[PDB]
Design a protein around this ligand. Structure first.
Ligand SMILES: O=P(O)(O)OC[C@H]1O[C@@](CO)(OP(=O)(O)O)[C@@H](O)[C@@H]1O
Ligand SMILES: O=P(O)(O)OC[C@H]1O[C@@](CO)(OP(=O)(O)O)[C@@H](O)[C@@H]1O
Ligand SMILES: O=P(O)(O)OC[C@H]1O[C@@](CO)(OP(=O)(O)O)[C@@H](O)[C@@H]1O
Ligand SMILES: O=P(O)(O)OC[C@H]1O[C@@](CO)(OP(=O)(O)O)[C@@H](O)[C@@H]1O
Ligand SMILES: [Zn+2]
Ligand SMILES: [Zn+2]
Ligand SMILES: [Zn+2]
Ligand SMILES: [Zn+2]
Lengths: 329, 329, 329, 329
């Protein structure tokens, strides 16, 4: 019995006795993700290089992928009639949906995560977090300022060697592989769980001169294990979505702590940290700033940044122990 | 006008007034790469998950991507009637083409580089090097034991966010993007040249405990610039093809030195180091083991390994100076 | 506001306050149609011709398209958990769905209509009719023996120059174009209505020697109009789905009356005639055997055949007038 | 082994030791056809219906398929540097290629045959004929006014249930199926030969009132066989490319004789009749106006029309005997 994302979302909606907005919202996200994936794989690029001459395009139309991905998500999400407030990594202000297309959900997303990797063709993706409108007053950015703990759904689409959508909800994380031949997401891994301990650490060591003492000690242990065990392997794709997905399926730890230029970390809380922390916790993993659970942070700005350490429980707990140690004084 | 890979190779073939055997070889390579890309992107995966029931399957047809990639390259290259000897990262022995389909070219290739990144969907690719048989004796593995400097063509196909084929030849390096909508590689970057100096270093620091003093000094310098400039950023996808491609388009340096487990380096000379070194040099970059030019090494084993350092001239040269410094003490 | 089939089916389900089975059933049909379309367009045929050699397929697996289409519909429909009885043009007996996957709907379908056109690559398609389980006793073929008038939904997917799905339900016919780049059916024509009168007649005139007097007279009028108006144009693709679709969008008339070898017509009532008659009537057209409305016929066999004349109201009414004339005696 | 169109043309080019200009011309044609097929199948249509909002569009970029097909062929053929004169069914005047991209071949083509079938999604296609410039004078339309017998290559691409390219050359007719998954034409039928006698006749009988006595007698014979055998079945898709392809693979006969509106026949000699006549004769079939061989007609107008009868030898010959009979009374 093959299960598609459409059938999965549909069934989860019935068992939850929902009106249907969530189901319509997730269906729309699915459609947006497929449209972004096709664009990312460069389908139709021949037209941009004049295969049919230049009789159609009479003006600027060469949209960058990150801009195009943003337009697809915003437009497709709006046409779902299930959202009221949208927060995008590419927009300064929150987007308030017209009354005519207004729904009950708040969506925070990162249209094309891994900007620096776009031009070198390295894996990139889309990250999303979904909240249910809390207050009863007019929708505003405030509706997006909820602790990740309030998330009803979160996940990401990875445009890697293949395109995969990872969806996390109250009862677990499920992985769907996109079959581009039929434009259908196929459930390939249900109720995913991260391993208790991995053997890979992921972090940009270029900021070494600015790491706090705990991060410094932890990395030293990965390379020169005090107990003489085997050193961990290192991997840093440069796109959060790619490094986090590898962490989920292979185990290990991912880190982006604070540094000189980024005193409160670089990654954004609403559409990078929280969605990933939610997926991680639903998979049996941990996500911390090194001092507190990411999902417990109360956002004060829609573009707020936060340090983040996530991955296998035992690996993240070891780092937390080091932070506690350097705080005991 | 628009230039497809097919027209590019055809044209280049006519320029050097060739019999067309090399042209057919490149055409076949193009076909193999497109076929591998389609499989990598998981087209038709729905059938494996029973969309059409379990009536189609009759045995145990569950070929892993790496085995499929190897079968595709081998079968397609043989069908080109342009090769006599094939060396694959997946085969312990060189493959001697039957007399009927025998051609004069020797091809060394890595069907699906980035084995550890296959399951986590991170970028992977195909690497190839082409030599002309320089002998009259019956074809044997010895025909593949030529220094990289003898290559007539080399390159790789990167199955990342998009699929790109990079081809280096005597005249230079050119990049073609695969437009999956029409199955055609489109020339998008002519006579590519790498930046003289970059700002990214790429290495698996998990082997820090095993690096020689030169590698160690260089890495420290990247994190703690003596001139107090901004430290280099770090990136290590884990797939040579992906890290090297980024090195080529963004500049910087890629390293895989020797360590305890790999005293002679891990990467293989014939289908990993040589092809990438040739692409690098044709692009104005450098490729060294730290003590000699990769392309000058005369191999004695088709699966010979070698340490490798490649990338922007100034960056590689800086590391070479550290090596030369220690050897002068 | 772009509308996809998924969103259309979802909304129609909500407005109807249905449990969700219909929506799941239509979603499944959508998925099956995309899988058949990709196969029909021959994606992956290179593998059948040995592009990767012959290492996987160790036995028979070269399924004919008509057989494959049948497996996809049956399997996908079953996994919807919304059906109890299935009638296929390719199966002698009705298919009774397992209690575990049993739903309330009865589906009659023609997996790949236009058998004679399969090998010459002329347009072919899939036709479907959906009934709601009436009786309360165990499901049997009897549940499929309902007059077309009881249909809750019907339509077809045309695999022509492009793939299109036409869906007819209680309040109208809607046309969805499949965008293969994203595997998404896009609503392109809503609440379709056939023109009152067309200028094209479609019938296999090869059976002329066996046509009844009314058909003979009608065809004579199309070629030699008694009032000297312009003669009608003739078109007969040979695939009912193609000829009927053209009739719907261009207007005119389609005919397949009785003949020597086919005394009660050739087309089957449950999965060819009724579905098309329903689409036609919902579009403001007519569908008759020449003596009675197709949708009013009470089926006595699941593979019962029936003569059928359908299309623009004025064109079909003219033929009915001729039948009445030749019956007045 | 597996043979792609690219390898087939390349090989054939080497056999006749050509400079490779014809090879590049065929390669370009292959690219144009794949691009047309993708558009015909409606890839990316979702963008036209606002999936990404209305920010991409800036003017009135709504090119109809026929105009797009014409722009693709023209642009791609010019980019081949192998042509000097182009004749399109869509252009009133012959297109003379600029001196820079000038080659020695003259190409006559029908970019999207079956205009009336475009909107109803019935099979459509591209027809082409290639001549070598036989003169030293500056290229002009006169170079395209050669009898079909001078063709060096001709064929068509049928965008039906699947996309197939049929190529005829001095040595024979070969059929290649387009595998859209990898964008490659695969040889699936070598040295095709039409059946000596068929069982299908194809003509628009709507012009019955205007047919000459020979056509009328022949059709009556197909419906009322004097030998009392089974009558021929009828088929008329309405797109020459589709009806002719079926004629080639199933045998039988295709006819488009003169009528009141088209006293010299409707189909055009240079890009409809000649290409199909050449394919037919290379396949062992016949092509006549009823009074002379189509390939022997020396045109005086690039848009010259001609009556045409083509298909299985015995069938065509039977009709010719009727013509000869009347001319002998
Ligand atoms: O270059 P560094 O500092 O490593 O930052 C990379 C991180 O920033 C992000 C932020 O989105 O990439 P980027 O800034 O290139 O968009 C994450 O995807 C990634 O984890
Ligand atoms: O895991 P480490 O030791 O970093 O090795 C990674 C390197 O080895 C290679 C060799 O192919 O990957 P892998 O062994 O996983 O196939 C290169 O692609 C890559 O650069
Ligand atoms: O060959 P004739 O007698 O015209 O029959 C064609 C009709 O039969 C059908 C029945 O499905 O095709 P076919 O028998 O080739 O499958 C219809 O699609 C079509 O309308
Ligand atoms: O409509 P009728 O007169 O049958 O003409 C159909 C013939 O004309 C052509 C000419 O191209 O179609 P069309 O005019 O619709 O483009 C042929 O494809 C086809 O065989
Ligand atoms: Zn991001
Ligand atoms: Zn490798
Ligand atoms: Zn049928
Ligand atoms: Zn035409």
């Amino acid at each position: 019995n093959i299960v598609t994302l459409t059938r999965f979302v549909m069934e989860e909606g019935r068992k939850a006795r929902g009106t249907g907005e969530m189901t319509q919202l997730l269906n729309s996200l699915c459609t947006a993700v497929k449209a972004i994936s096709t664009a990312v794989r460069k389908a139709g690029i021949a037209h941009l290089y004049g295969i049919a001459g230049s009789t159609n395009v009479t003006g600027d139309q060469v949209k960058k992928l990150d801009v195009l991905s943003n337009d697809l998500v915003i437009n497709v999400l709006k046409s779902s009639f299930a959202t009221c407030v949208l927060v995008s990594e590419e927009d300064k202000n929150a987007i308030i949906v017209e009354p005519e297309k207004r729904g009950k959900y708040v969506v925070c997303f990162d249209p094309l995560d891994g900007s620096s990797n776009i031009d070198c063709l390295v894996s990139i993706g889309t990250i999303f977090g979904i909240y249910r409108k809390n207050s009863t007053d007019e929708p505003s950015e405030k509706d997006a300022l909820q602790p990740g703990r309030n998330l009803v759904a979160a996940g990401y689409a990875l445009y890697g060697s293949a395109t995969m959508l990872v969806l996390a909800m109250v009862n677990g994380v499920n992985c769907f592989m996109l079959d581009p031949a039929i434009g259908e997401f196929i459930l390939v891994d249900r109720d995913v769980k991260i391993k208790k301990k991995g053997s890979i650490y992921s972090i940009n060591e270029g900021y070494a001169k600015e790491f706090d003492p705990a991060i410094t000690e932890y990395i030293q242990r990965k390379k020169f294990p005090p107990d003489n065990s085997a050193p961990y392997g290192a991997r840093y794709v440069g796109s959060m979505v790619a490094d986090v997905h590898r962490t989920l399926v292979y185990g290990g730890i991912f880190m982006y702590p604070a540094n000189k230029k980024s005193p409160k970390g670089k990654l954004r809380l609403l559409y990078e940290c929280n969605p990933m922390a939610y997926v991680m916790e639903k998979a049996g993993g941990l996500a911390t700033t090194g001092k507190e659970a990411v999902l417990d942070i109360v956002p004060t700005d829609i573009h707020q940044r936060a340090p983040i350490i996530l991955g296998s429980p035992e690996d993240v707990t070891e780092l937390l122990e080091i932070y506690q140690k350097h705080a005991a004084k």
